[PDB]
Amino acid sequence: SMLIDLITSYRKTAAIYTFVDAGLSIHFKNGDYVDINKLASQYGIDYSRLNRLCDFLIEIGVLVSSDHGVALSEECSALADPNSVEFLTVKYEINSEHWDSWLMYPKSLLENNGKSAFEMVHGKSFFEHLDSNKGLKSDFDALMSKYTNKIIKELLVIYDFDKHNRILDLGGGDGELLIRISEQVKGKDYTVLDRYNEVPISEGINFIKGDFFKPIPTGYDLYILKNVLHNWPDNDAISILKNCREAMDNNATLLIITLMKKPQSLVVKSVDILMDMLFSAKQRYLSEFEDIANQAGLVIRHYKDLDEIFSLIELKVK
Amino acid sequence: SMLIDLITSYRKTAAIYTFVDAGLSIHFKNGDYVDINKLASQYGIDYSRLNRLCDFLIEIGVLVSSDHGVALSEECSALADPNSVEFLTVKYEINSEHWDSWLMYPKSLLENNGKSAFEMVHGKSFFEHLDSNKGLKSDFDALMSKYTNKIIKELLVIYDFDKHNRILDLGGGDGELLIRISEQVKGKDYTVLDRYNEVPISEGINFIKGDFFKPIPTGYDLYILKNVLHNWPDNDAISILKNCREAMDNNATLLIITLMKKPQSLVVKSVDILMDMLFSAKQRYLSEFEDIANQAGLVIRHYKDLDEIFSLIELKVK
Numbered sequence: 001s002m003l004i005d006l007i008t009s010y011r012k013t014a015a016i017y018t019f020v021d022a023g024l025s026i027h028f029k030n031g032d033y034v035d036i037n038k039l040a041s042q043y044g045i046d047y048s049r050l051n052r053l054c055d056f057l058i059e060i061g062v063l064v065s066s067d068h069g070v071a072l073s074e075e076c077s078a079l080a081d082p083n084s085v086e087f088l089t090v091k092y093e094i095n096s097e098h099w100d101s102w103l104m105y106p107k108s109l110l111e112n113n114g115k116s117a118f119e120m121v122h123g124k125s126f127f128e129h130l131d132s133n134k135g136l137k138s139d140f141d142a143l144m145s146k147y148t149n150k151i152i153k154e155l156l157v158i159y160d161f162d163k164h165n166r167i168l169d170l171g172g173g174d175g176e177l178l179i180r181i182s183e184q185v186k187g188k189d190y191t192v193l194d195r196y197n198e199v200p201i202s203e204g205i206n207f208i209k210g211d212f213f214k215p216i217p218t219g220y221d222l223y224i225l226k227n228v229l230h231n232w233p234d235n236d237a238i239s240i241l242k243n244c245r246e247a248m249d250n251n252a253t254l255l256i257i258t259l260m261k262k263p264q265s266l267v268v269k270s271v272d273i274l275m276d277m278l279f280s281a282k283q284r285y286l287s288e289f290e291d292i293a294n295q296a297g298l299v300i301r302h303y304k305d306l307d308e309i310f311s312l313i314e315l316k317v318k
Numbered sequence: 319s320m321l322i323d324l325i326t327s328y329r330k331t332a333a334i335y336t337f338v339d340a341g342l343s344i345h346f347k348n349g350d351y352v353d354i355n356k357l358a359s360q361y362g363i364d365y366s367r368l369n370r371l372c373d374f375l376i377e378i379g380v381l382v383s384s385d386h387g388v389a390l391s392e393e394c395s396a397l398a399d400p401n402s403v404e405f406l407t408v409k410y411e412i413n414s415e416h417w418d419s420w421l422m423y424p425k426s427l428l429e430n431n432g433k434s435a436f437e438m439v440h441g442k443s444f445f446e447h448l449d450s451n452k453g454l455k456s457d458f459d460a461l462m463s464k465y466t467n468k469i470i471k472e473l474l475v476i477y478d479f480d481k482h483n484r485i486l487d488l489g490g491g492d493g494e495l496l497i498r499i500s501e502q503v504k505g506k507d508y509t510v511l512d513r514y515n516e517v518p519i520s521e522g523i524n525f526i527k528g529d530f531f532k533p534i535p536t537g538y539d540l541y542i543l544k545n546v547l548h549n550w551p552d553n554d555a556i557s558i559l560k561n562c563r564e565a566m567d568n569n570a571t572l573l574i575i576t577l578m579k580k581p582q583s584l585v586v587k588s589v590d591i592l593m594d595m596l597f598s599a600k601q602r603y604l605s606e607f608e609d610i611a612n613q614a615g616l617v618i619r620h621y622k623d624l625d626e627i628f629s630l631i632e633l634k635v636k
């Protein structure tokens with residue numbers, strides 16, 4: 001049955017998580033079939049239990065069985081290396097932080113206390129929690145780093161960075177975007193602004209410890225907000241764009257790179273509900289961006305799709 | 319692709335859970351279309367948030383959209399009535415008890431101790447927790463009644479209960495199996511043995527406050543163990559069957575009704591890993607049942623499958 005499958009489909013996610021979290025996933029690199037006995041004994045885990053878990057992973061199409069042993073299906077090869085979008089999603093997402101928050105999401109809808117489902121559980125914010133927990137922030141950074149590297153090739157084609165002198169990335173985190181821009185485009189002043197417990201280091205990249213809810217520095221002709229605004233409700237989103245405009249002069253460009261909400265994109269709509277749970281935020285239509293931008297005294301001069309999911313909005317002062 | 323869908327598919331479970339847990343699902347009976355803005359108004363929920371959630375539920379095929387409003391898809395109609403196996407699965411399974419314990423499952427593999435993933439999280443056994451938490455036990459027993467009611471018709475056809483005078487249901491919970499058999503087969507001594515805080519009341523049904531790890535009462539010509547042995551590891555399972563044998567005389571019959579482990583079945587494999595997580599237990603093959611029954615000094619006289627998941631095993635002391 002369709003419905004009962006959807007309800008019990010969480011057990012599949014769990015089974016894949018446990019396989020990864022236990023570190024078993026590494027040993028199935030490049031379609032190498034494996035003997036379970038050695039793996040069970042290697043990790044000091046009961047063979048019977050591991051054999052049964054594999055048997056379940058074989059039925060959902062994660063693994064394949066033979067006389068030689070057990071291998072990852074070509075479709076699920078990504079679980080092998082630990083620096084993959086599928087692997088890094090499991091490491092970042094499948095934890096108490098999301099799963100305990102998901103169980104509080106219904107309570108957060110019924111109770112109209114402004115606080116989000118995550119905040120309800122943890123008593124803090126998402127990003128306030130990541131400052132306390134180093135382990136999860138390294139997983140968060142690593143996953144975000146992958147989503148930037150999908151965009152780079154197209155981003156450099158459709159936008160001219162050669163014409164800019166001083167580039168500031170607001171909520172840049174690692175500064176992966178600017179590091180990857182700096183490889184291709186040299187002889188520019190690159191600055192990353194984000195909440196730092198400790199300042200990152202990279203060749204030719206400046207790192208500012210700042211809060212974009214406070215006044216933004218002047219002198220930069222390029223301001224960037226990549227995957228920031230979908231973490232903030234309208235009132236908080238407008239505040240960020242208001243501080244951006246005041247900092248901007250009439251020749252300055254503001255780049256917004258985000259997941260664009262579309263009628264068909266289930267991928268975006270699943271993240272849209274995820275953003276409501278974590279931050280009481282949302283993914284936005286082109287109209288919703290024009291609304292918050294208009295209130296901030298900014299005007300959309302260029303819109304273009306980078307990817308199936310990611311898009312680029314080019315704003316200016318007016 | 320497949321892999322990323324499997325990893326993020328848990329978000330679909332969460333969405334359906336929130337729709338049910340918030341008590342919205344009840345207003346979608348008889349394929350009736352409902353207004354989102356009035357639903358939002360009734361439970362004091364924000365229309366924007368509810369509309370976006372409904373948007374996600376429409377995309378996964380739970381809901382259908384119209385000018386009239388939104389309705390549950392014909393395949394997901396079951397979310398309407400609170401007495402559906404799908405609804406009761408959400409109420410029983412989608413909670414901290416399973417999800418927080420699923421996150422510990424990889425720890426409980428890597429550790430080759432006697433404690434299950436649930437025991438590590440809660441510090442108690444699963445059934446010890448249900449004694450403390452009254453709300454979940456009512457939902458647990460409610461789901462169990464449904465799996466009981468799917469089997470009764472074929473169970474009464476294939477097994478003659480009229481030949482037995484005194485029947486004892488070991489771990490019968492609420493006497494749903496004995497209540498449903500007492501309807502069609504009348505004028506018999508029906509007795510249910512289980513861990514009760516307070517004893518249930520049903521006409522013609524007796525309820526003993528007992529532990530099947532202690533010596534089982536003698537003089538019953540039928541003993542039943544329906545969905546009990548899959549909650550226990552071999553050493554504990556053998557102990558229950560040893561107690562049954564000691565209680566049984568040469569004319570006595572033991573009925574085992576269970577989810578039989580079959581080679582190609584995803585439904586049973588998923589429950590098999592769930593049983594390991596909760597109780598460090600498993601679903602068993604016919605050979606595995608014979609093995610623990612042999613060590614328990616019991617002999618399999620009859621085996622028959624009642625449906626696609628549930629089977630029946632008659633055991634006799636010989």
Ligand SMILES: Nc1ncnc2c1ncn2[C@@H]1O[C@H](CSCC[C@H](N)C(=O)O)[C@@H](O)[C@H]1O
Pocket residue numbers: 127144145147148170171172173174176177193194195210211212213226227228231
């Ligand atoms: N008040 C604040 N000021 C600056 N940065 C902030 C902030 N609150 C959150 N952030 C940062 O905003 C970012 C949101 S997600 C960032 C992803 C990154 N730009 C990328 O695509 O690679 C995080 O780095 C978070 O730490």
Ligand SMILES: Nc1ncnc2c1ncn2[C@@H]1O[C@H](CSCC[C@H](N)C(=O)O)[C@@H](O)[C@H]1O
Pocket residue numbers: 445462463466488489490491492494495511512513528529530531544545546549
């Ligand atoms: N030591 C023990 N002695 C007796 N019953 C026990 C027990 N430990 C657990 N149980 C009971 O075993 C049952 C497990 S599930 C059985 C449900 C029931 N046979 C049905 O299918 O409708 C629960 O009712 C639980 O309370």
Ligand SMILES: [Cl-]
Pocket residue numbers: 543544545546547548549575576577
């Ligand atoms: Cl069983």
Ligand code: NI
Pocket residue numbers: 476620621622
């Ligand atoms: Ni038969």
